[PDB]
Design a protein around this ligand. Structure first.
Ligand SMILES: N[C@@H](CCC(=O)O)C(=O)O
Ligand SMILES: [Ca+2]
Lengths: 351, 190
């Protein structure tokens, strides 16, 4: 009764996502007997259809899995730069980065890993076949769904900047010269065909089949770099999670190629040295301490983080409590330190 | 970018954060596949010391290279309490993902907020460069005055993130919350 905000409650299973339709797809899978991984893959495919803003088959991401028995693991299905990519590929003739090239051109794309990631997880930790978890998404693509406020707003705002500039994109997301409006039905026949082939041929359809061919051609015809060799060489990777201990609670998150786990643990390590509970939420003291701690972590991020398969990341030093303590001792609760006075930390004494 | 969480009847948990990077990515569909293409390459450091779209900078470690995976900030996360899965969370937000998830953890552990309370609480963020303490609407004018007195450069900006979280009760019961910042989302179970 003292609570202003109440959580949704359930006794058996639960799914939380950015889209109602996708969430319901996941719940149905659980009700059908699928485990968390089965449901997660189903939701992932469903969002690839109902949330084109971010849900996808053409991107990548990370998955954290923790079994009922405590086994915790991470699935890295981050995109890989094409084999033809070069260090200075985004610099103009003057040597200055061109944001247009890295955000809106065909050179902005990395080799997609979502399909590979979901299959690696499903095959090892799931219980259902790919065709069964892809079916819900397939139906949504084939039969369509109603455009809601979220999708309509995104199409009008972010979509207007890029979707109408490409013929194939415009044919799907635009209508009568304008972005699809709330209430309109969005049918994605081509995506439905892609989903249908993945369900029947497996992930190879994406990395070596018809889909791969379509991606390679899109690239070759428009100055892009992703080739069939790139797609055929892509692999999702299971890695050990980065973890820490905060006041007796264990925190597990993503390891490199993500900087998330390392810095969340680093910052918590720093905060552990202060009585946060005493200051309380929304207090200037609590915010001051955290803002300061965050500066050091982001400074370290700019120097030490990258793909672990190409560079050695000093994750042990970065998540070392003694190192965190040395940072905590520098924080003045009454005076912020300018970023110009903060540089990446010296990790030698902690490694 | 988008994040979703799942917990089944047996207690298994999964947290997934995936993306095209910016909204709709490049906005380019791959031929007749109907599949949108990512613009994840902007997550690499194009040139040492020059910021990308999220104000993040890098050097040699995150430089563009063939077959290399660009550094991410995505943080699907699970917090364990008394040896058992307790909080499953994550969020989109580029450079802000780290601090958004951090706040979910701190709110849950230090402030004892239930999953919905932690989700609806205002957020703040400082990423070193640029040198500004970014805040959402919702903080007391009295508190912000004190922060400015301490030397923080407070900047009121757009809402940050979209957490989709699940907390596991002591008796195994589930509690969930979808972010007020994103409409048409949902947390549901059975
Ligand atoms: N591409 C960013 C995510 C951007 C977003 O959350 O919108 C990353 O991997 O850190
Ligand atoms: Ca919401």
């Amino acid at each position: 009764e003292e609570d202003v905000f109440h959580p949704v409650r359930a006794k058996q299973g639960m799914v939380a996502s950015v889209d109602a339709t996708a969430t319901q797809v996941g719940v149905d899978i659980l009700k059908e007997g699928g485990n968390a991984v089965d449901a997660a893959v189903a939701v992932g495919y469903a969002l690839a259809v109902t949330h084109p803003q971010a849900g996808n088959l053409g991107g990548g991401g990370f998955m954290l899995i923790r079994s009922k028995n405590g086994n915790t693991t991470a699935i890295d299905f981050r995109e890989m730069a094409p084999a033809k990519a070069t260090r200075d590929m985004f610099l103009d003739d003057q040597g200055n980065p061109d944001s247009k090239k890295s955000l809106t051109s065909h050179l902005a794309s990395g080799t997609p890993g979502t399909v590979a990631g979901f299959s690696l997880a499903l095959d090892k930790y799931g219980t259902m076949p790919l065709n069964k978890v892809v079916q819900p998404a397939f139906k949504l693509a084939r039969d369509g769904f109603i455009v809601n406020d979220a999708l309509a707003d995104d199409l009008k705002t972010y979509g207007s900047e890029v979707l109408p500039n490409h013929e194939n994109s415009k044919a799907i997301f635009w209508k009568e010269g304008e972005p699809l409006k709330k209430g309109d039905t969005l049918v994605q026949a081509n995506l439905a065909k892609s989903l249908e082939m993945i369900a029947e041929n497996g992930p190879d359809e994406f990395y070596k089949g018809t889909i791969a061919e379509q991606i390679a051609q899109e690239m070759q015809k428009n100055g892009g770099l992703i080739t069939k060799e790139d797609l055929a060489a892509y692999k999702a990777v299971e890695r050990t999670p980065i973890s820490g201990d905060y006041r007796g609670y264990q925190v597990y998150s993503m390891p490199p190629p993500s900087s998330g786990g390392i810095h969340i643990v680093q910052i918590l390590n720093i905060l552990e040295n202060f009585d946060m509970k005493k200051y309380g939420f929304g207090s200037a003291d609590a915010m001051q301490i955290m803002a300061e701690a965050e500066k050091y972590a982001y400074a370290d991020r700019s120097e030490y983080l990258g793909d672990p398969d190409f560079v050695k990341v000093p994750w042990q030093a970065l998540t070392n409590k003694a190192y965190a303590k040395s940072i905590a001792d520098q924080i003045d609760i009454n005076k912020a330190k300018p970023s110009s006075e903060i540089r990446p930390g010296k990790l030698a004494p902690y490694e | 970018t988008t994040h979703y969480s799942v917990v089944d009847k047996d207690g298994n948990a999964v947290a997934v954060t995936y993306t095209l990077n910016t909204t709709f990515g490049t906005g380019i569909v791959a031929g007749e596949s109907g599949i949108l293409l990512n613009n994840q390459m902007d997550d690499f450091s194009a040139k040492p010391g020059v910021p990308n779209v999220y104000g993040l900078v890098g050097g040699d470690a995150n430089a563009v290279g063939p077959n290399k995976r660009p550094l991410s900030s995505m943080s699907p996360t699970i917090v364990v309490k008394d040896g058992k899965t307790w909080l499953v969370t994550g969020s989109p937000g580029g450079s802000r993902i780290i601090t958004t998830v951090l706040q979910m953890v701190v709110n849950s552990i230090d402030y004892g907020l239930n999953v919905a309370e932690a989700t609806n609480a205002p957020r703040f963020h400082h990423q070193w460069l640029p040198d500004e303490l970014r805040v959402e609407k919702g903080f007391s004018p009295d508190t912000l005055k004190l922060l400015e007195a301490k030397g923080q450069k407070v900047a009121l900006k757009e809402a940050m993130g979209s957490t989709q979280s699940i907390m596991v009760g002591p008796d195994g019961e589930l509690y969930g919350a979808s972010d007020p910042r994103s409409v048409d989302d949902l947390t549901a179970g059975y």
